[PDB]
Amino acid sequence: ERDAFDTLFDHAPDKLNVVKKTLITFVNKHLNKLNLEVTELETQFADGVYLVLLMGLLEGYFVPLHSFFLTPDSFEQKVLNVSFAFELMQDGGLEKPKPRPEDIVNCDLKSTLRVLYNLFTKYRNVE
């Protein structure tokens, strides 16, 4: 099974470009609160750190930095971080994400963008 996000990612370069553009703006609206900048969606979410921090910010709090692997030393620590971000998503009411947590760690762009897009849809009005 595929959906409209598969269709644009797979077939619509111009629409994909505004999606990416919008996602970079959105993730920085929040991550800039921590003096963090994203420039490259392809890799800067792979280690799970920004994704955890973003999830706290979208729900109005700062996640304790010792509660996840702030400087992950391995594939496994990255996967654990992504899994924790997915847990926070579900705790807040989102359906379990489509992608495996390791898909994000392995820098699958479509997986990364879908996850971020579903956050944007839900949380675009968080200040």
Residue numbers in the entry: 246 to 372
Paper text:
The adaptor protein paxillin contains five conserved leucine-rich (LD) motifs that interact with a variety of focal adhesion proteins, such as α-parvin. α-parvin (Olski et al., 2001), also known as actopaxin or CH-ILKBP (Tu et al., 2001), is part of the ILK signaling complex (Tu et al., 2001), plays an essential role in adhesion-dependent PKB/Act activation (Fukuda et al., 2003) and in the regulation of actin organization (LaLonde et al., 2005) and Rac activation (LaLonde et al., 2005; Zhang et al., 2004). It belongs to the highly conserved parvin family that shares a common architecture composed of a variable N-terminal region followed by two CH domains (Olski et al., 2001). Our results demonstrate that full-length α-parvin contains a single LD binding site, formed by the N-linker helix, helix A, and helix G of the C-terminal type-5 CH domain.
However, limited proteolysis led to the identification of a stable fragment, α-parvin-CHC, that readily crystallized. This fragment includes residues 242–372 and thereby spans the entire C-terminal CH domain as defined by SMART (Schultz et al., 1998) and a portion of the inter-CH domain linker. The refined structural model includes α-parvin residues 246–372 (molecule A) or 247–372 (molecule B) and represents the first high-resolution crystal structure of a type-5 CH domain. In spite of very low levels of sequence conservation (≤26% identity) compared to canonical type-1 CH domains, α-parvin-CHC exhibits a typical CH domain core composed of four main α-helices (αA, αC, αE, and αG; nomenclature from Djinovic Carugo et al., 1997), which are connected by loops and shorter helical elements (αD and αF). Atypically, however, the N-terminal boundary of α-parvin-CHC is extended by a short α-helix comprising residues 249 to 256. We therefore conclude that the N-linker helix forms an integral part of the type-5 CH domain of α-parvin, which is in agreement with its resistance to proteolysis. Another feature peculiar to this type-5 CH domain is the loop between helices C and E, which contains a 3 (or 4)-residue insertion (relative to type-1 CH domains) that is conserved throughout the parvin family. Interestingly, the crystal structure of α−parvin-CHC presented here shows that part of the putative ABS2 region is obstructed by the N-linker helix.
